[PDB]
Design a binder for this molecule. Sequence first.
Ligand SMILES: Nc1ncnc2c1ncn2[C@@H]1O[C@H](COP(=O)(O)OP(=O)(O)OP(O)(O)=S)[C@@H](O)[C@H]1O
Ligand SMILES: Nc1ncnc2c1ncn2[C@@H]1O[C@H](COP(=O)(O)OP(=O)(O)OP(O)(O)=S)[C@@H](O)[C@H]1O
Ligand SMILES: Nc1ncnc2c1ncn2[C@@H]1O[C@H](COP(=O)(O)OP(=O)(O)OP(O)(O)=S)[C@@H](O)[C@H]1O
Ligand SMILES: [Mg+2]
Lengths: 351, 236, 223, 119
Amino acid sequence: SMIESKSWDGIKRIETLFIDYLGAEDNHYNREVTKKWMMGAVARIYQPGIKYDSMIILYGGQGVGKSTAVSKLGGHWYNQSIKTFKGDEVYKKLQGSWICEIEELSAFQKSTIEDIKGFISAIVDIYRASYGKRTERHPRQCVFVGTTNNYEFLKDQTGNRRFFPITTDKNKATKSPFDDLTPVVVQQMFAEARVYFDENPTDKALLLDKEASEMALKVQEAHSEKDALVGEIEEFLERPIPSDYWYRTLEEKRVSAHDVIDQDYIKLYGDGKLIEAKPGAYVWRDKVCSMEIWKVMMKRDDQPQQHHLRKIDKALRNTNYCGTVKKQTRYGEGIGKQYGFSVDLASYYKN
Amino acid sequence: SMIESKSWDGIKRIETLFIDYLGAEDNHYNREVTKKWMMGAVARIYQPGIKYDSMIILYGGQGVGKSTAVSKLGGHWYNQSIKTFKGDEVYKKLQGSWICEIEELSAFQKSTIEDIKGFISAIVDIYRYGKRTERHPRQCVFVGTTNNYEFLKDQTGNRRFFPITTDKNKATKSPFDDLTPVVVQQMFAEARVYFDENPTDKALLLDKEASEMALKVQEAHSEKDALVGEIEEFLE
Amino acid sequence: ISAIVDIYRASYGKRTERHPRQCVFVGTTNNYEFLKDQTGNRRFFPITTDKNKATKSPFDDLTPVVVQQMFAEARVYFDENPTDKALLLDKEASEMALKVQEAHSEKDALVGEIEEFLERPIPSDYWYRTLEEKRVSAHDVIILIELPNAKPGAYVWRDKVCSMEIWKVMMKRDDQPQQHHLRKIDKALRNTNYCGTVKKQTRYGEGIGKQYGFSVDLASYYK
Amino acid sequence: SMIESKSWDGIKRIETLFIDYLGAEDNHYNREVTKKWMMGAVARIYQPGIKYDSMIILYGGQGVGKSTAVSKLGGHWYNQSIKTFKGDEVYKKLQGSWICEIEELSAFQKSTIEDIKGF
Ligand SMILES: Nc1ncnc2c1ncn2[C@@H]1O[C@H](COP(=O)(O)OP(=O)(O)OP(O)(O)=S)[C@@H](O)[C@H]1O
Ligand SMILES: Nc1ncnc2c1ncn2[C@@H]1O[C@H](COP(=O)(O)OP(=O)(O)OP(O)(O)=S)[C@@H](O)[C@H]1O
Ligand SMILES: Nc1ncnc2c1ncn2[C@@H]1O[C@H](COP(=O)(O)OP(=O)(O)OP(O)(O)=S)[C@@H](O)[C@H]1O
Ligand SMILES: [Mg+2]
């Protein structure tokens, strides 16, 4: 009834919603993502089972007004009680809720990425009523928008395509959500969203544009917490190692791997190099092991725990030089016969 | 109804399920384990309370279409909304589910692996307005989809998790366009035929050589502990 | 604290009802630095009480008549403008409240150390140096162009800062940092006024490699 | 009902159960322990309070079929649910099971010496 209370005027408000109410930059990504979120909300109202695994995340200052803007859009159906993603109670809390706010991403701290994906991407809520006799099977009519104050809130890098961060700034806000997001204005926003959705009512219409998706990937990486080990591993792997390197003891292996030459002095020919008998003296690395990284690159002597090599293996896989399958080979006196990668520096030395 | 909606003509689709759709290897282990998985699914449908503790696990990139292929196989009765595996209410989440998929985005904790072992190991569920209504069937068959290459930690979990390595650019058929309800129905009819040739749980087990080289695969997908080699070098 | 509605189902209830929050919160503390947030604490309003400066005693003088009179006065003031905006503090009160909240909050001592480290001029060839050379040159104490008792342009202002550069050069630590160390260094860098807020990938050196870092602008410092 | 469903013919297959099905050596210790284990199983299903502190641990390769032999022995009453000896959850998973299997002795890794000895 609210959506159809008034016909849309034609003012095109939803695209610049967070742009001029919260100060988000006037990118194509922001416009597309806010438009798609509004259409997704209207779709979940009109098609209660429609698929939608996206969610907006609003980053900004303490006083910018993110929660107030979400509350105005939610109105009576706004939800502020999703503090966890586990248990059967939250699905009951999503009954009369349409716009749901993961305030401060509090649930994120408690939950795991799999739980977040399962909660966001669900379609139905299977639970019996308090006094009913039969399970009710309510479709999921709620759409999720989270607000945060921490810049680097996406700690994981495996599943992050769902979250679309938006960077707000109070100084950039032309309007104010406190007195300008009147119920008539949100009604006119949702009317426009309904018009756009009706232009093509399908679950694929809620996906982002190709250019919008291309910026979305970059923004998700910019808001994702990075691993600084992979850069160090890559720099260590890019060092030419002398020929007959695996036949040296560990003590001289460390000094050979820690004699660093500038990349201008390589004087390469694709594979051969004269670092200034010289052409064959040094050669690119052919293999690397997690234990070799532990003992040679980090100059460690204590026996490493399992999680250290788990982290080193993750870093080596994230490295663009190493593959993904591990082969068993002898590495040296301190490393022994180990499962290691086959580093191929083809991406490197193409300079 | 769907499995018996149409009989099975001779096409031999059961063996090359994940090979030509997810770019797996044309290996005897892959064919045998995919065939046994489909037979286990149709057996759990037909002989509801059966002993089938195996679990296909698919490894691949972020977009090889393993979850899409699993959803295409499951249809309406595909399930992914299972994230915790210990407790009592979990058995309620299995009511309308046939193919349950466990997706591992980030690395599972050591407890979660034991939880999924003890979950897929069950063959019966108990729920409830009288007579305790023991939901004996347990028609569910489980498939996991993992992002990390090395997902096996314990030696206990081996011999029950059957990993399959899925690659891209080598898949003959696209899972987004070629897994249609007709083809999956024909595959399940073929599985019905093969399982009905020997309706027993012993028929769901792998071939002897298939199992012995499944041991090799499970070793190739497990953590290495990296210390036996150093001790060997010290001893040498 | 900021929540306005609680959605939940009562003990003997039919549905998960929405309950507007009719309660107002006050806290009493004995610790001084009780605010543990460094980003901001606008909602909290620390009031520093002190006995021997109390002209009246809450144990004897706060009779229910007195509190009823206080709440009647509050109702009068609110009814002068029955709006949420009326509840907001005065423009001067807000400016003083910002200072009070930062006074009663916990401080990140790493931020000052980071800022001091970034203020040291570095040799023009700083990035084309060994890690030990970087530790030697950066750790010395040192008229946009500088003359630290040398030729002009031998020392310039820093333009890139990495968390691993902080970990390896400023702290001079050869230990491999846990992710919680680099998270703290990243927060310290973001709270720095010289440092920006968006990280861009660039290669730093032999021990650091190609890693995401900030472009640092010392315009505030040398001016 | 199953135990006395059919009388016992004098075949003498109790003392060599693990000997000729799992390949254990033909020691006197092996025969005695497996015979006493089966006698204790029958006792505990007949005299529920009987005191039987023993439990047989089958050590062997990963293909000898220890779990298979144990499951065949147990029948519909075989249990592999137990994973730890801490709390009342183990007692609640130990009620409807005649034979309980400590898979890979995982519980032994997750519990103290005193806890496993008491349980
Ligand atoms: N009626 C109002 N008129 C103007 N400003 C208001 C009003 N109500 C609250 N504010 C101010 O708006 C800011 C709080 O708005 P919120 O929606 O809580 O912002 P937020 O950025 O979501 O906050 P957090 O703390 O990050 S959840 C504070 O500066 C308040 O003083
Ligand atoms: N026509 C298409 N339809 C659907 N997805 C497509 C299509 N073309 C490419 N894709 C991509 O294929 C992937 C589909 O994979 P999913 O089934 O959603 O999850 P997945 O393949 O299992 O990967 P993970 O590691 O589990 S998230 C997504 O990354 C899509 O962007
Ligand atoms: N028909 C068969 N004949 C012989 N061996 C078989 C046959 N079917 C399966 N196996 C093997 O028997 C083993 C089955 O494992 P289980 O039943 O748990 O017994 P197990 O050998 O103790 O294994 P674990 O890991 O120690 S519990 C696997 O090694 C299979 O390869
Ligand atoms: Mg807020």
